[PDB]
Amino acid sequence: PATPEQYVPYSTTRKKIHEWVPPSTPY
């Protein structure tokens, strides 16, 4: 010509679903 840097997996996917967020104030 013990180490803390350990690979840890993800789910690199952007979560692929969206739940209705309930209405903030009552009726």
Add this chain to the structure above:
Amino acid sequence: VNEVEHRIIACDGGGGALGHPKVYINLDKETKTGTCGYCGLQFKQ
């Protein structure tokens, strides 16, 4: 942005057999710099 003279240009990926499949891009409208779908390189007519 890779400036060019010709209407159409190639983009072997900066290589022959070591780059990406060779596609010809139409830098025909200055309005848009052609972008090879493989390298994301914009070419300025």
Add this chain to the structure above:
Amino acid sequence: FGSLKDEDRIFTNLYGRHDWRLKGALRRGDWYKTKEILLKGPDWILGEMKTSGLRGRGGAGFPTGLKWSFMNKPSDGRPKYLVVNADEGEPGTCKDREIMRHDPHKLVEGCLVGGRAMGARAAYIYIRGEFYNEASNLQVAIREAYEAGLIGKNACGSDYDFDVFVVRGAGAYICGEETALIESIEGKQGKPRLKPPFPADVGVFGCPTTVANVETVAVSPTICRRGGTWFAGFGRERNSGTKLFNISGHVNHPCTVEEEMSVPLKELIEKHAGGVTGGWDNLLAVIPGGSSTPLIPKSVCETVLMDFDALVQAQTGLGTAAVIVMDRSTDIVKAIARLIEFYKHESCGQCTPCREGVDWMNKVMARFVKGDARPAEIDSLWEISKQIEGHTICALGDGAAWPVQGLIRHFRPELEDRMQRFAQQH
């Protein structure tokens, strides 16, 4: 054979020298037996052409009588029509330009003589848009004729009705095709149709229609008025009649002479027209029928006379009988190369073979002129050529392949040297 007598030359006003207008036409006596002919019967007119055995005067050669016979079948409630294509995009076809610029009536009475043969309600003449001048001359002539009452309802003092119209072409060679012209008239893009629905059965405006080279329509009245057999004698076997021959390029006096058919090729440049510029040995090749037909090299030039049977024996087509001649100073390869450039700038692109194939040969041909391409590529263009020849929707792809095939067939050593020349200088 040859030396057609002036007394036998149909287009007497060729070269002008007469009044292309009606009074000149009357001295020509073009409208002499028109009433009688129509009176005789449609069946009498087709008997005359069948006896004549006239072949198509356009690039394709077919018995004229049989083609007209096809739509002589009884009307099915759709008006039958006549389409005269005055477009002649093929290089060297100034053949037709003559009959519009001059002797326009010859074609006007050709139209009605032909019209009753097919029982056409009306005839539309598609002149090339470029010939604005020519278009102006004919409708002046058409206007004269109706004023006379020669054409129109009860045309020529007879039961039969005919109306003749002129349609503007728009600079397209393909508009010259049998079917594509129909589409141009119909007002859609000029793209040929497939042959299954033959023009007669399906037509301009979806009615029965027939298409004739202007020369074919023009000679009808004279072939019938005069003796068709008279004409037949001039032709050779299936070949018959005088067809205008245009000689252009590398000849001392390029001109269109309506000399007789079956002319020795060596004879027509040597005797009429102008002997090949530079001498009859300065002939690298002859294009007999125009760009579509394959060129024949000198070796075969003097041997075969000009007639469709003799040419097909020779592997070339009489076509429009446009003789284009090349001397030895020419670049056979660049000459044919521009004809492929002539076809890439012109094919409609409707069919896959022609679209990519003609462009593919153009790219290879340009490299061949430079000599950049290797020798092995030359036969590969052979193979690309026949893929286009039998697969195309119309004949233009047929036509593009033939000049390429001719260059490889007789001038293969020259192209190899151009191959060699570039490889040596590196």
Add this chain to the structure above:
Amino acid sequence: FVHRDTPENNPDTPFDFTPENYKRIEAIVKNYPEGHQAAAVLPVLDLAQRQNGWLPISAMNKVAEVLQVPPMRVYEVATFYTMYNRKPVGKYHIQVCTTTPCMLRDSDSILETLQRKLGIKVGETTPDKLFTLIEVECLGACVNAPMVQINDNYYEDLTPKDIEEIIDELKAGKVPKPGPRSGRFCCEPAGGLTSLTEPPKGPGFGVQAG
């Protein structure tokens, strides 16, 4: 083949057939069978070109309206034919025939001369907008292989000096004797007619009882 709207060449420009033009419009239609006004496109599109050489997107749309056809129809017809110009051509549009028949007669030889005289590249309008040169294909007057078409003038057997006389006549004055130059007329064997010199045989001649 894409009309990117431009202030000059755009739908904004108003196109309408002159009262006289509209008249012409109808004449054409009747030539075609009734209910087949659609066929009028080519001839009509031609009169829009006669009106104005530019024939902008607005003009095509107008044609569609007049003939009741779908605009795309008209757009397809205009794009397919070279006769129509979708861009502003110059006042005098010079078209030089460069197919093999003419080339062998040094048609190209003409080209070089015209480029210098117009002092401009081949394919664009002169700054004067005076002339526009284009390398058009076969024009059907091969017999006189040297040949250039100037707005229908259709000149022939042109030589550098011939074009010289012609271009100068267009630049100053008008109607420069359009037609062949050598005097060979139209398709005359230059040396001599060699035929048709014998007088017309007259009507009736040869009838042979058909």
Add this chain to the structure above:
Amino acid sequence: TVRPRSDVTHKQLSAFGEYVAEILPKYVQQVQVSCLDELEICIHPDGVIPTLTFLRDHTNAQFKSLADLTAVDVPTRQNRFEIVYNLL
């Protein structure tokens, strides 16, 4: 790219296939030499011991070794399993 093959084999083996079919008509339902030049005698299940004994012990066809016994399962066929015995 086309296998180098010997037609001698197709014929010779085809001929044996007719021989086996003639010698054992009661159990053999179909005999066919494939184009891979191999032979296949298809026997009724009852012919399993007769057909294999004839091949193991016949002077004109000694097939001493059992290369393998396997069963293709075509679920469609009524009799799904197709036991196949390859002999050398």
Add this chain to the structure above:
Amino acid sequence: SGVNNTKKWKMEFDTRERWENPLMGWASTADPLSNMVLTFSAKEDAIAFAEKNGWSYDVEEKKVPKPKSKSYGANFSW
């Protein structure tokens, strides 16, 4: 427009839970008979296999395109 994948009758099972592996985000499942697509050659031979194995079936009749008459010239009429 290839019709070579619509000629043999298949017997596929019901679609049960396809969920997400908490650690890597992959799709996980507990349906052992999920990737099962037996291929038969006729309705008769598929009903037989299902009845044979004790599964419940939902036969769906074949849907071959009917013949539609096509002609080139037709589009040229007026």
Add this chain to the structure above:
Amino acid sequence: PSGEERCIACKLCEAICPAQAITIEAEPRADGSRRTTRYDIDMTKCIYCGFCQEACPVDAIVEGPNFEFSTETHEELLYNKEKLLNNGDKWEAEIAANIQADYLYR
């Protein structure tokens, strides 16, 4: 070289993978370009057969000359796109020499 990931999510990368190890869910990356949001190998299923480096039409996924990457845990072998991309941001001086060394034979 520019710095643009070579992977254009053709999914061919995992189609041939016989151990069924790769999941490369993708999106348009908001440049209009085409790239992965997901890429994966489970290195406890892979077989080091190189059917992924010879199928890739762009030379994105390779199979480097490491063989000292043992791990004390199971999770450190389920590589993600960022343990393969910075991995490839490590050995590229050492990979390209071997690609350039064997490209002709391949």
Add this chain to the structure above:
Amino acid sequence: SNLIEVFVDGQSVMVEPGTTVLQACEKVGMQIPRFCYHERLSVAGNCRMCLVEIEKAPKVVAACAMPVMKGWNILTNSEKSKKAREGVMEFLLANHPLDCPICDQGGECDLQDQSMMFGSDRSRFLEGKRAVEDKNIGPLVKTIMTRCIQCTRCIRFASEIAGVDDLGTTGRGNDMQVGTYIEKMFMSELSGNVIDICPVGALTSKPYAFTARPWETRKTESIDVMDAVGSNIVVSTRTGEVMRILPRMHEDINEEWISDKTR
């Protein structure tokens, strides 16, 4: 009984007068490789990839437009009708841009298959390819039209199923570009069908741009609930989330087409 008899490589089928040569092969069971011919779209003959050779006949005929006549035996696997496909596929591929790993009609290509089954092992086009200019036809159709094989299916559908004649061919020669001369979006219901009907991946779906690749998609056949026509549809699911809904044919309800809403 106006059946007329015609031979498919000998099977000697009997067919109604007026059935195309391609149709005659279908009833025997043979498939003519075809582009530009769709059952519910008019015959156009643009590709001529379907050239076959009827017997003792001079030239190859287009199976899409030739009405079969009496006693013509079609030879669909002759030495000629294969050179008539080995040489057409040479042309379609010659001007084609190699971005099959971009073309999301990767495994859904009727042009790689026919190349991969009836076409040629190699290429002889050592020249320069062409390129067209991507335009915007809407927010549903991504027209990367440098892919287009000028098969004019799109133009017809746009004009015969959807009555929106906005699309059209412009220009001649190899320059023919199939699109909308002025940039006017193709806004109509029935719009998304163009995707499904273009065998090339020139114009494809923009939302389902690059989320998947067809071999992976598990396909479950279900029904349309967005509208009351109840159009049949196939929901393509990968690893448990729906990736695309494309039409599946029901002669009576939706015959191969679905609405822009339910896709």
Add this chain to the structure above:
Amino acid sequence: YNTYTFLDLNLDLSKFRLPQPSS
């Protein structure tokens, strides 16, 4: 000659032309 002369000749031969059929 002039740009409008060809069509004006058509304008003129209108009457000359008899009626046209209708579909």
